[PDB]
Design a protein around this ligand. Structure first.
Ligand SMILES: *[C@@](O)([C@H](Cc1ccccc1)NC(C)=O)[C@@]1(C)CO1
Lengths: 222, 204, 198, 196, 233, 222, 125, 212, 198, 196
């Protein structure tokens, strides 16, 4: 019997800063035990200072990103070239996902950008539509490896002040754009070491009030 | 359905400078239901430490089996069991039940009394020896532990510094696992002394 | 499944076991004693498969009594519970396993302290201040986690089990026809005949 | 079932056995598997008897409507109509059809249509359960531009071996010769082909 | 929902300094039976694109018909059909990629794995993959079925990344393709010795080669191998 | 897993990767897949790792006892016959796929064994998930009458093809050379082309970060 | 099938079909309604053109929409039954979904809504 | 997932946890489980996260459309039945949801409606939905009185979640509190279970078995 | 399944319906009224599928009330029961059937006689002196076959149902949390609020 | 797999392809399917590689023990030992074995043993997946008492056609000649037999 779904592997990572947002993802596309591509873009700039990546089944991922980019295009036509806010984009993607509730997109989509206050925003989506604004989110194959690390290093979980006998937690002094990239790169190298579907190359898309910047880094090709 | 996912729990081992560390959570459960917060998964026979994950009935059985076998070993050899030799004893004992295996994830940790060499080892349910110089992980949050250990670990850590590494690797992995938590305990193994520390963590 | 509850207070172990025996569509008995005396100071309650539940209990009873005659000595609650665990561990990998969940309620005369052990059909032993088998814990544990103290009297322990049973009689769909309550202390094992309206 | 069609010097000859079976019982030992869809365009039928009859009847209808409007259809046109029905309804059909016809310009042509519904133009084609046993024989003995005498002998020797080894095949060997002279029916009985 | 009846095996491809090379063998397999030997599995569209299809042959012929209709449709009301408004390899792929994904979404897929090879109007190399699931990806080397497992490792030795593309000439790239076809004939049970090869160049144009055979095969070492362990004669 | 065996003019060479996986997660990044039956007969394992290790040690133990009983050097055909008859008895339930090679008084030998008990003999062989990637290189570069150094290069290149192309393989290359008149040289980590790059940040925690409830000394001495 | 635009605008800006529908009301028997402090009273007149009717079975001018709402009318008797039936269905549908009987304002809004729909739909008067 | 809503003198207390799990994997510890239908109405979330989040927000659209139409505030009975009837249309399709719709109207007073994916609609005083619902019921039933103060009722809902978060493997993260009055709901903060456990343990004396 | 009981005496029809709503592991409600008033002198009780049970009941209620307004007349209990039967008969061969079992308890004002109708989800109507759906009849019928008389008073009918409930509360494993009792006679429909300890 | 053994004037010749497949991948392209069980008694193997190797090893053991006590065994005796293992363990074995040996008195003999475990003495026998395609060719071209030259050509042409159509068959054509002169190994490469 024909199975309409597949697993293209990969892992994406989205961390929201104080006035910035990053959306990273490996460039490796796979099928079973074979590498389809060592460089296949996964994080896309959709316009209006919004970046998007739908990881899982690549055919469903490409269709959703393509349909959202078109939704942004029509939002300009219908509403006199109004900028689509990150919360408005998030709600729009829910209806795009829930529209196929009984035949879902097999993807974990994450969007990053800035809110109407200029603060960093990251939204993570369920394959069927459920969404929530989060501080940081890893999605895909090595998501279970990266997320516990982020709780410890970004949110300072299980960390206390030395000498306080575990009564005072480590203060939430938030990280700069340089510090977040360091955590992103270390997350993906650790993912490449321990997960077979992660590697080849890392591409990070940084979103600020100026626009969208792109950075590329080499990963292990084994 | 999966016998290694009924009770829950995790064990992690790490090497350092002239020292080894082994840690586990204290949770015992029945699917969603939490049963016990005192189910220790680390056991010792002389100076060799063993951490067992998986089905709790097999955890207790193997502990009693390896206590049975190390006691007879000590009477015959007139000496305590060694980490390298005990690793082979676990491997052969697990493979003896190849087609009816104990649903476990055993972890050996200790320092050789003669050479002073830090030693850790890992096993699957059928007795495959995983001898890594860095870290050994096992349990329902094995993926979470692999991600923690690969990022936090650095070679040649002091006993006081290695404690911080293994504790943070265990706690943050257990908080991302439903079947792990409910307290934690860390052993710091040295040539002369062993320090046992209970950790403060989330109770949900 | 049947209701099996246990609580260890200051000086005694209290066990509460449901009276109902249900087969298919009818309740055949509403006064069944789902417990066996293993030794003067050790009591075991049980629930599970129809036939296995009593057969296993009487098998354990016969072995402990055999030991008591041979050595002229009563085994410690720890030694009895370990024996029960090994039998269930051997059973789980046999041709046809004993599907029996047990609670060991005993008073150690040497230690002068009450002890409660919880072992399921797989052979999973755990020493607990309070224990339950099956779905019983889902309704009761939150009440036990709230009110329980280690220095509680036997009277206080009976009041907490009363609150536990009242919650079971309200939220649980099955009618278990009340419970038989037994106390295990330094003087032996006695039955609380007045729990129907305590 | 053993069916084949071979192009030669003067045109094309279609050959078939006469056995249709329901399990191990022969329901019909004198079946005609060589069906006419147009004056000089014929087909060989294998697989489901109900499906192949229904397809051939629709094709004959399509080619009759074609002739009324546009004149005599080509063999390629007839093969396309067969393909259109077989490919589009592949989930519901079990049909292996050899399409062979004679043209004044294109001479003799053979198109085979397997289960999936694809077209394959070939000098000769073999189909059915009995064809598996004669792949070796036909490949070593087939020549292009054979005479009528040789082509009949080629199909007669090939199908005799197909009948001999296959239980699903048997009966008589039927042949339909398509040339400029016309349409000729040929029949060969067990007493002749079994002793070849 | 369907099943493949008549099948075509691997389609392997790579890109060099001036264009792309794509190749596929001339077999039409019927299960384990190697039924048809005159099957062209490389479909040239215009003078700048070659489409290589593996899998179901009846579905391949349908795609072949769709590509011929696209040429006819593009030429309608178009005076620049052979110039500026000619069919690009990118237009041909995207159309097929849309069709492939729509068919799988209707639960009735075209049982194929397709590689579109060609050179764009600006001179850029085009090489992209699409299958029955609608999954699309680009790589310096692309191969379907057994080619993905065997030909890809060999072709990636010549071109490992994007910087290796301008360093690879036509002669070296074609040699790697011919060698890959030999290896596929060695280890793939559904392969043919006869194959077709297509070269799309930004300077010399489209070069379609037919009736190529696998040559220089090593078999001599077989005579020295006897038995399965202990047998000496 | 990628394992190969190459015959040369005066002996035989076997090579393997060092990646051990539990599904999509890498358990060991540097494991030994080259096992020893006897001093001059070596084995390469693929499939169930516990099965390959145990079947090598069992037959290796019996080979040692046979060698001492017969007062003769172990033969490859002996190790081969004992392995195949053991694997056949268990009807493929023992998932051991092995490439066995070695030198003895009768010469150099190379064999491959499957889990069901079938054996194959050749000059170049490959097994595992990266077998097809390895065989591709072997079918392209192999020639008759190879020298020692050429055989090492050919076997190592075949393993590399498994590392880069197959997801079930990675990390390092282990090689074992077995020559007619010399001792077998086992080359652990012959090539290390997958060295982990330095982390962007040191994650050494300040002392007193983790909260401790209770502390005690464990008694080792009886 | 039939969608001919019967109700349309005229040069002066009137819908004649709606305008002539009011003329049918002018022909219908007089119906009056008055509200007091604690009651509402509806009164209707009966025709005297033919006098030999059975008052028991003859459909009365005042119809109950629900147990609390009543409806009287003026005009074509046959057209009113359609409005009464649809109002009675809507009254029950409102009780089914909102779990509360209709307000008089809502029932009026529905009836007037049905009447308005017939003033700009093709094929209806 | 543990969600409760009880009816009392001062209105309605809505208390939920914040953990989301897929099998053994904890997806998040900070997931909202109360949908703010409007300034007056609330809806709990249990079962399928997408089914609850989509349709309860859709419910807010229908409630707003009703109030524009009728020029009057929508009752809890009418609002709950909108979702109930919609869910019943999808019965058998595979929706998974168990929700409480809470509101305080002048016509009804405080009102709780239990609506699930099977199409069950029940009005009641006390409801708990989720995998840890049984643990919540224990603490709730034994301490519930109608004459509870707002302060004590907020604590009881908070305590009931804590008991369930502790014992149920799928429940945890943080506690979200709500107090519904006639003028609207009042949000009463997010309380991390990790910090709340030790605070309650010391002040109350409960959770003796846990060492701290 | 839930308890749905009905009995027709001399001058009235008495319906007894269980108060429990059980979903999976918990009893969510213990005061549920599993009945709807179709007309002033006709009452229908219901049990079955979680969602279908109330949706069907309210659908019938809406239709009967629509008829009552249109004709300014109350349909006879026979006419109502025939309408309910046909709706269940149409449902059984649809895409997704109503899994609802009903009891029609009505008093005919024209005949001056009480009437009780029993229809299952398939659409099987039967006029009975006493009826029950599901497993309810297995415990009750023998008591009803023994004590029932046609000339019984309303008070006598309440005593017989009490005996029927007592048998259900003893032998049946499910706790149905008591019953709501309603009387249907010439004066309309009233609820017996004192059946908890009558 | 394509295996055959043909008796002739001077003895018997066994023929086989060299392809063993795991699905669609050729795990070995130089396999020797012609296994010796005694000096002048050989066997052709088809089906499960693990089964046929285990059977042949046991037969070689039995015939070695036979020779130590009773001398050189007959071809019928060797076929009987093969059958005894195949028939009694039919539920656990998938083996199609052709047994062919030379005797000084009995000349050349061929015994085929299909899946079930029956023995059939034949002038020649074909087995394996590829044999189905050459049933027609072999029946029409086989003659009794052919010369060595003719028999080699007969097997070479038969297996070439078997390899051509069957995907499971391929590689090189291996031949073992059994006569009074001794045992002769023959090999034919793809460059020769494909163009026949
Ligand atoms: C609970 O029922 C979850 C999680 C959840 C998140 C948000 C809204 C509703 C539910 N639901 C699922 C699908 O399981 C818990 C944590 C037990 O899983």
């Amino acid at each position: 019997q024909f199975n309409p779904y597949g697993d293209n592997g990969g892992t994406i990572l989205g961390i929201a800063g104080e006035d910035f947002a990053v959306l990273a993802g490996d460039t490796r596309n796979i099928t079973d035990y074979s590498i389809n591509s060592r460089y296949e873009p996964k994080v896309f700039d959709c316009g209006d200072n919004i970046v998007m990546s739908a990881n899982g089944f690549a055919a469903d991922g490409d269709a959703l990103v393509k349909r959202f980019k078109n939704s942004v295009k029509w939002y300009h036509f219908d509403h006199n070239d109004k900028k689509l806010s990150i919360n408005s984009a998030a709600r729009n993607i829910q209806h795009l996902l829930y529209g196929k509730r009984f035949f879902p997109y097999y993807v974990h989509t994450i969007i990053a950008g800035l809110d109407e206050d200029g603060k960093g925003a990251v939204y993570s989506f369920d394959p069927v539509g459920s969404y929530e604004r989060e501080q940081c989110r890893a999605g895909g194959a090595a998501a279970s490896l990266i997320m516990p690390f982020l709780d410890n290093q970004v949110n300072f979980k299980n960390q206390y002040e030395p000498g306080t006998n575990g009564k005072v937690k480590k203060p939430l002094k938030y990280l700069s754009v340089e510090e977040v990239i360091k955590l992103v790169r270390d997350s993906f190298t650790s993912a490449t070491e321990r997960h077979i579907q992660v590697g080849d190359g890392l591409e990070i898309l940084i979103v600020t009030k100026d626009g969208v910047r792109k950075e590329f880094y080499e990963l292990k090709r084994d | 359905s999966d016998p290694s996912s009924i009770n829950g729990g995790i064990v992690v081992a790490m090497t350092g400078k002239d020292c080894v560390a082994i840690a586990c959570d204290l949770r015992l459960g029945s699917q969603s239901l939490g049963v016990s917060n005192k189910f220790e998964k680390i056991f010792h026979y002389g100076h060799v430490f063993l951490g067992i994950t998986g089905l709790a009935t097999d955890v207790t059985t193997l502990n009693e089996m390896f206590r049975y076998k190390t006691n007879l070993y000590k009477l015959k050899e007139e000496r305590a069991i060694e980490p390298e030799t005990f690793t082979q004893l676990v491997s052969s004992s697990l493979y003896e039940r190849r087609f009816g295996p104990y649903f476990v994830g055993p972890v050996v940790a200790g320092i050789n009394s003669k050479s002073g060499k830090p030693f850790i080892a890992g096993f699957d349910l059928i007795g495959c020896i995983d001898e890594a110089k860095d870290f050994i992980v096992s349990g329902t949050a094995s993926d979470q532990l692999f991600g923690m250990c690969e990022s936090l670990y650095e070679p040649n850590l002091e006993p006081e510094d290695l404690f911080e590494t293994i504790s943070q690797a265990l706690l943050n992995a257990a908080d991302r696992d439903a079947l792990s938590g409910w307290g934690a305990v860390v052993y710091i193994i040295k040539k002369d002394e062993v320090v046992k520390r209970y950790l403060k963590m989330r109770q949900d | 499944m049947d209701i099996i509850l246990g609580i260890r207070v200051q000086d005694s172990v209290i066990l509460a076991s449901s009276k109902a025996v249900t087969r298919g569509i009818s309740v055949l008995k509403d006064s069944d004693d789902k417990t066996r005396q293993l030794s003067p100071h050790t009591l075991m309650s049980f629930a599970g498969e129809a036939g296995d539940t009593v057969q296993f209990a009487e098998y354990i009873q016969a072995n402990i009594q055999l030991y008591s005659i041979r050595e002229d000595y009563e085994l410690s609650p720890q030694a009895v519970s370990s024996f029960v665990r090994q039998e269930l561990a051997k059973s789980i990998r046999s041709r046809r396993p004993y599907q029996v969940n047990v609670l060991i309620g005993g008073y150690d005369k040497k230690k002068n302290k009450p002890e409660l052990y919880q072992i399921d059909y797989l052979g999973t032993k755990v020493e607990l201040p309070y224990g339950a088998h099956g779905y019983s814990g889902f309704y009761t544990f939150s009440l036990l986690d709230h009110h329980y103290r280690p220095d509680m009297t036997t009277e206080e322990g009976l009041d907490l089990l009363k609150l536990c049973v009242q919650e079971l009689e309200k939220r649980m769909p099955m009618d278990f026809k009340g419970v038989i309550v037994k106390i295990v202390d330094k003087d032996g094992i006695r039955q609380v005949d007045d729990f129907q309206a305590q | 079932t053993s069916i084949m069609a071979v192009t030669f010097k003067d045109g094309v000859i279609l050959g078939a056995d006469s056995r249709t079976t329901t399990g191990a019982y022969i329901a019909n030992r004198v079946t005609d598997k060589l069906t006419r869809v147009h004056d000089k365009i014929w087909c060989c039928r294998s697989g489901s008897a109900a499906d192949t009859q229904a397809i051939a009847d629709i094709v004959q209808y399509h080619l009759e409507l074609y002739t009324s409007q546009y004149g005599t259809p080509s063999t390629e046109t007839a093969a396309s109509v067969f393909k259109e029905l077989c490919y589009e309804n592949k989930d519901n059909l079990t049909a292996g059809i050899i399409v062979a016809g004679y043209d004044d310009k294109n001479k003799g042509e053979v198109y085979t249509i397997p289960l999936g519904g694809s077209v394959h133009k070939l000098p000769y084609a073999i189909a059915g359960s009995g064809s598996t046993f004669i792949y070796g024989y036909c490949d070593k003995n087939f020549r292009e531009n054979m005479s009528k005498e040789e082509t009949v002998d080629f199909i007669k020797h090939s199908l005799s071996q197909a009948i001999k080894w296959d239980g699903s095949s048997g009966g008589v060997i039927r042949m339909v010769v398509l040339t400029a002279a016309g349409v000729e029916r040929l029949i060969f009985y067990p007493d002749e082909y079994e002793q070849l | 929902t369907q099943q493949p009846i008549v099948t075509g095996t691997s389609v392997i491809s790579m890109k060099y300094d001036n264009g792309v090379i794509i190749a596929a063998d001339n077999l039409g397999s019927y299960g384990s039976l190697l039924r048809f030997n005159g099957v062209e599995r490389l479909i040239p569209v215009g003078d700048n694109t070659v489409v290589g299809i593996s899998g179901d042959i009846s579905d391949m012929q349908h795609i072949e018909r769709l590509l011929k209709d696209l040429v006819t449709e593009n030429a309608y009301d178009n005076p620049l059909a052979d110039a500026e408004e000619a069919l690009e390899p990118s237009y041909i792929f995207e159309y097929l990629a849309t069709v492939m994904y729509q068919r799988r979404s209707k639960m009735n897929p075209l049982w194929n794995a397709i590689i579109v090879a060609g050179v764009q109007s600006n001179g850029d190399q085009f090489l992209r993959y699409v299958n029955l699931l609608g999954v699309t990806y680009s790589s310096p080397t692309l191969a379907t079925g057994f080619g993905a497992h065997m030909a890809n490792p060999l072709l990636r030795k010549v071109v490992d990344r994007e910087s290796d593309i301008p360093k690879t000439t036509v002669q070296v790239a074609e040699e790697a393709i011919v060698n890959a076809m030999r290896v596929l004939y060695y280890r793939d049970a559904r392969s043919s010795r006869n194959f077709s090869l297509a070269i799309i160049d930004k300077n010399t144009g489209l070069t379609f080669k037919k009736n190529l055979q696998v040559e220089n095969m090593k078999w001599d070492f077989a005579k020295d191998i006897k038995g399965y362990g202990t047998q000496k004669i | 897993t990628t394992i190969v065996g190459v015959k040369f003019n005066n002996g035989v060479v076997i090579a393997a990767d060092t990646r051990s996986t539990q599904g999509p997660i890498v358990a060991d990044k540097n494991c030994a897949k080259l096992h020893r039956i006897s001093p001059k007969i070596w084995c390469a394992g693929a499939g169930t790792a516990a099965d390959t290790e145990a079947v090598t040690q069992l037959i290796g133990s019996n080979i040692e006892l046979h060698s001492l009983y017969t007062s003769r050097e172990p033969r490859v055909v002996s190790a081969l016959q004992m392995l195949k008859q053991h694997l056949f008895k268990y009807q493929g339930h023992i998932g051991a796929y092995l490439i066995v090679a070695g030198v003895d008084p009768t010469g150099s030998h190379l064999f491959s064994i499957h889990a069901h008990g079938s054996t194959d003999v050749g000059y170049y062989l490959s097994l595992g998930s990266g077998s097809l990637a390895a065989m591709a290189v072997l079918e392209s570069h192999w020639k008759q009458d190879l020298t020692k150094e050429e055989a090492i290069k050919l076997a190592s290149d075949a393993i590399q093809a498994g590392i880069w192309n197959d997801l079930g393989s990675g990390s390092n290359v282990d090689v074992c050379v077995m020559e007619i008149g010399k001792d077998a040289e086992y080359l652990r980590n012959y090539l290390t082309p997958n060295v982990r790059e330095e982390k962007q940040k040191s994650y050494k925690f300040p002392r007193g970060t983790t909260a401790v409830l209770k502390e005690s000394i464990v008694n080792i001495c009886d | 099938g039939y969608d001919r635009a019967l109700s349309i605008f005229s040069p002066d800006g009137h819908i004649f079909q709606v305008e002539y529908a009011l003329e049918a009301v002018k022909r219908g028997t007089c119906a009056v309604g008055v509200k007091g402090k604690n009651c509402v009273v509806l009164g209707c007149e009966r025709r005297s053109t033919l006098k030999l009717q059975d008052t028991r079975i003859t459909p009365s001018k005042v119809s109950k929409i629900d147990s609390h709402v009543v409806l009287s009318f003026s005009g074509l008797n046959a057209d009113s039954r359609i409005l009464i039936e649809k109002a009675r269905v809507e009254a029950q549908s409102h009780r089914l979904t909102l779990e509360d009987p209709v307000t008089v304002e809502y029932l009026t809004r529905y009836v007037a809504g049905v009447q308005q729909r017939y003033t700009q739909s093709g094929g209806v008067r | 997932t543990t969600t409760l809503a009880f009816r009392f003198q001062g209105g309605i207390i809505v208390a939920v946890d914040s953990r989301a799990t897929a099998g053994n994997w904890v997806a998040s510890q900070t997931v909202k489980k109360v949908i703010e239908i409007n300034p007056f109405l609330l809806g709990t979330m249990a079962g399928g996260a997408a089914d609850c989040q989509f349709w309860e927000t859709w419910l807010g659209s229908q409630c707003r459309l009703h109030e524009l139409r009728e020029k009057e505030r929508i009752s809890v009975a009418a609002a709950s039945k909108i979702l109930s009837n919609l869910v019943y249309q999808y019965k058998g399709a595979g929706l998974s949801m168990g929700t409480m719709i809470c509101g305080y109207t002048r016509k009804e007073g405080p009102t709780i409606y239990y609506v699930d994916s099977d199409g069950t609609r029940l009005k009641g005083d006390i409801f708990c939905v989720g995998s840890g619902q049984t643990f919540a019921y224990g603490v709730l039933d034994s301490n519930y009185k109608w004459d509870l103060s707002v302060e004590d009722a907020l604590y009881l809902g908070k305590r009931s979640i804590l008991a369930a978060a502790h014992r149920d493997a799928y429940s945890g993260g943080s506690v979200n509190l709500y107090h519904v009055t006639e003028d609207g709901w009042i949000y009463h903060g997010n309380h991390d279970v990790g910090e709340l456990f030790w605070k309650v343990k010391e002040e109350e004396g409960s959770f003796n078995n846990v060492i701290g």
